[PDB]
Point group: none
Chain length 121, copies 14
């Protein structure tokens, strides 16, 4: 009664939090998009500091503007074209947008169930 509606509210909140995390992930992917574009603007041999995880940054030059390895998923690095792999990243972004739309549909379904429980008089 009250309990199922509160459960639906907690479900909607978890969906909202996962949508926010997903959008932060998409924004991180677009940051990596801009980063790879910025690398392609830069030329070879230029002194570059790159992080070591934490706030230490070690120094490198540039030598690898041809095309870049990337994970297919979770474990991988295969040297694909940065254009092609970057398009694949955008395809992943579009998949996550579709997933976000499915989650929004789930939010609408939960609100519809709460509406039905209200309409049960």
């Amino acid at each position: 009664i009250n309990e199922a509606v509160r459960a639906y509210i907690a479900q909607i909140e978890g969906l909202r939090a996962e949508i926010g995390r997903l959008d932060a992930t998409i924004a991180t992917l677009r940051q990596s998009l801009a980063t790879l574009k910025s690398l392609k603007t830069l030329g070879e041999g230029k002194t570059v500091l790159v992080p070591v995880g934490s706030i230490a940054q070690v120094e490198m030059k540039v030598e690898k503007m041809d095309k870049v390895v990337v994970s297919v998923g979770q474990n991988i690095s295969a040297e694909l074209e940065y254009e092609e792999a970057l398009k694949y990243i955008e395809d992943e972004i579009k998949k996550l947008l579709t997933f976000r739309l499915v989650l929004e549909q789930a939010i609408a379904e939960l609100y519809a169930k709460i509406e039905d429980l209200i309409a049960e008089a």
Copy 2:
């Protein structure tokens, strides 16, 4: 009464999760610590594939085996000696362990408050 002990248990679990995140951060710092040491095992000029943030990796070489930049806090860069700044990271880890002990004392305090509300009977 019920509410006070409920808030006590909620604070205990919140501090527990914060201690877990703290120790995960400590383990991350120690992974970066060993990563810097493994950088010191290598030599200059060696071709190394390193990530771009997200899961693509680009190619670097070594030229910075003397001293590495790091933040004072949150914003900063400071080219300090890897030994002294490394020990400074270790000291930060020690201070986080001290703060963890303080939080464990606070959990003992909340349990003592629960014991006091018991002893009111």
Copy 3:
């Protein structure tokens, strides 16, 4: 008596840790499932780096887009349809979600028992 209350606390803590491990397992299975999907985005013959457990990665090529072996559990293997295996993974994920709901019910039951012990005055 009060050590039994602390035992209830430790039970709720261990159930919360089980919730965290279970949710991490579910998220790991979803990451591996999206990894399988990302494999299905690729085609045969394409060179792919894959790890050996530890951080050495050997190079493979794809010839396994037909249908994929998977365990029943802990010892097993059986070649099934990747869509059917997708369904099987999603089903076991939903089973673990239901199990997590049962765990949260047990946590609420333990809190209700603590509240009854408070109400024993």
Copy 4:
């Protein structure tokens, strides 16, 4: 009184569990060691079923008898000779053994402090 001694006991327990995790990690490294050796026993082109992380497996042929990527640490995979980098893994194992000896010395120091507190009477 009882407090610092019990704290020393808890420290000894945590160090014992960390030594166990360390040796389990070393055993995992040796499993990967023997796995890479058994890969070197095989020749190129051999049809081999390999996992996807989680419990599904995919099929590959062999093309990795020259040199394998390996981490500096936590983010990295640098293409090195399997021989020298594998000996470097063994050297890191020896470093972990040295650290294990230091931890066992620390445990002996903790019991020495306990028995000093005994001898204070």
Copy 5:
């Protein structure tokens, strides 16, 4: 009916987002806490890169270890003791914790109103 409950749910979501923003602000204050502590660990004269807003960083040294200017609110260049002003920052954090408790009470009030509207049958 459906409308007032939907409005209450939108209110609870806006409160949740504002609590998340407030807690991110508190975390930023604790980052500033750690930053000031890290500054006080540093000594005068040592070269330091500080950001310029955007990702450029310009170079300085330390001469500000006596006591630090801060804002009273929104406008102010008030020079206070870094200890005393840092205690004032912690006092602000405690005020925001109290404010978060008031907001959580408001969330419980909105849930109680939804419960009442359900109980009107």
Copy 6:
């Protein structure tokens, strides 16, 4: 439819908010642009109050009017000539304006879709 038109309105408002955040970022970059130019107006050895991130400020001196570090993207430090990297920031702003024009074209596309749905009589 009605739902498609409301989805169009939501997408147009999301693009409008993206345009607002984008132009705010552009204005922030131009503020940092003028800030770097104002640093170039000053001389070396000059005592200046500089922030600590949050609202406290510390005291700097000037020694580094030659050329300033900057990120390539998202993680980087790279000491480039302030004029050349400054023009690079300007070109990034130009690309953001181009992307803004693309988003304006997309708003015109959604408006044309609304026009088509009207034209379906």
Copy 7:
């Protein structure tokens, strides 16, 4: 027809811009609210720098913890109790919130008009 839809678009956009301006105004009022509270945290006699509009800040001691002048509106001032006038600020904030609710009602009315025009077929 198309014109009426475009006019509804421009109206909903202008109302959304009014919502944004009103929310920025309310946020500015709450910043001034916390600023007044922060002034009440201090004491008389303390040396304080305060701005002159632009970035110049001149120095003062405190003598305004008794009761403060505040505008009636647009041209006015009158010395009132900081508590009661602070409450009055909160009351005008709530009136603007009610006004914003009326604005969102008008937006929903405009979308209802859009849906009516679609249902005219």
Copy 8:
């Protein structure tokens, strides 16, 4: 054909609004500058009401007729001579006048492009 014409018109309008905002900023600088000079006409220790952001005003006194803070930019307030900061603000005003001349040249270039479209016949 006429899209670029309306784009020219919109750019001229945006530059006109930019000139308006810029001259309003310059006039604001002059108002605060004359306010500072009016403070310099006054002597120390004089009781003065000054605002809190919002239109409440707190009471101050004068002791700061020696040298006043000023920004490098966007984050800064460095205590400099009011005469030299005066002249610096005047120089920045002259820079904004030069930029205004450049914008008016750009408007003339847009009408020259209109003349080009005329001459295409």
Copy 9:
């Protein structure tokens, strides 16, 4: 011919400036609206500082909470009911909104005539 189109552009700019002045007048009327509201919130007898137009303010109290004089226009005074005359102020604001719509129509007419002169060739 081309002079006429340039004159049309100057007319559109003068109309835009008149729209800006008109909206400033409307905002002035809304500030006077809120000021009269704030007057009606205050009671009789309370000492209130009101300006002399320019820089100085003089002191008054409230005794006019019944019905308020206002001009018909430019010369007039007529004591009418503050709510009814305030509604009349809102009515004149609506008249200015209608006039603003007429001006927007005229700008569309001028751009249409420009594009017709284009379409002549």
Copy 10:
């Protein structure tokens, strides 16, 4: 050739408009001067209608013959002697007239530049 002459004419016209605005401001100051004079001719308690900004007027009694507040500039207030601050307003008028004479000298120098452009034949 023609352009600098036309720009000088435009600058002379803009300075002439500034002269007109300045003298209108000075005349407004003298109107406020005579207004405060006529207030000082009156006595306390006198029933007086005074405006609300816009054309409506509200009723006041007089209690402000002691001495009158005055702003420093754009934000400020301070109670000064009405005679002394009124003399200060007169001094500000003298400053504005001095600045007007400086502008007239500048216009004469602009025509001298025009005469130089003539004399370059």
Copy 11:
């Protein structure tokens, strides 16, 4: 030679001043227009204060919403219908706008003569 230049300057100045006076006249006629329209919104019998030249106002009511005096040239009025004569006043405003455009053409001719005298050399 230079006398023609000074004559052109004084003519452009006097024409600019008469343009400003004519625009003030047009704005005055529009204010009286809005005043008469506001009288038309009022009804007969309503008590109305009207000025006596100087800023005393005397009281009347409305009886004259049917016909109003007007004069054609420069001397003496006579009474016709209010709204047709109001249209006649608006047409006189349009003819003054035409005359103003003739004066603007004359100013352009004066600068053309300036350019001709420059082009003589």
Copy 12:
């Protein structure tokens, strides 16, 4: 030499024009004074048209022979005794005559400065 003489001439002519405008204002107040006398000659309900600014005139009737409002200055009105305020405006005219005599003294002083320049031989 003759420069300051011509400046004296310009000053004297500006003061003469201001004396002329002052005497025009005096005659204006006297004609309004005689208009008030004409109001006192008439009786109630009499209908003679009144100027409404422009050539348009509306019809009054008389009900305001008790005592009449009058401005204090620039924004004001207040119902005073028409005879008392009549004498007061007359005394303001007398003070304007006094200031006119002061200006005539200043012109005599300027001619005395001219005589000093004669006497500098």
Copy 13:
């Protein structure tokens, strides 16, 4: 005496290792439990790879959806129902939980004896 303390510590560590082994046994029972459950989900006839104990696997098909053989140990089993033997496994798991609680009691007893030996002063 202190040998006995070290013996107590070794006993506590052996009990902890036994708890770890027993909990690993329980987790093994749960993994094989859910494995047999997922075997019960699968149907007959499906080709299934199953191990030989050690490294290699052999291929089977399902015909065992009736019920399950089991023994206490090692000589002569008996086929009982899979749900009934499932409950039997769960009962033995509960027995191991009880035994684990007994071991935890024994660890508390050993620490209590250590604390008593400390308390023998």
Copy 14:
């Protein structure tokens, strides 16, 4: 002195336990391999009593008399000939026996070190 000798003895005991674990592994391989031989003695279609880890056994017909899946190491599978994988496991056993002989050499070398410590008299 004798302590490092006792440490050598503990090392020899750990090596002896490793020898025992290694021989247990080799015996396990031989037992599973003889179980594979017993499988090869059977034929297809025969129901087979197979241990399934825990005390549950299932039944199976044979279809796996062609070539057998087997891991490379820890993760892998490879359908190879049972004679070929037989010889493969045999050669791995030979490698383990070789490593055992190396460990026996290490034990003899440690005893030789202890003999050297005897010889240091």
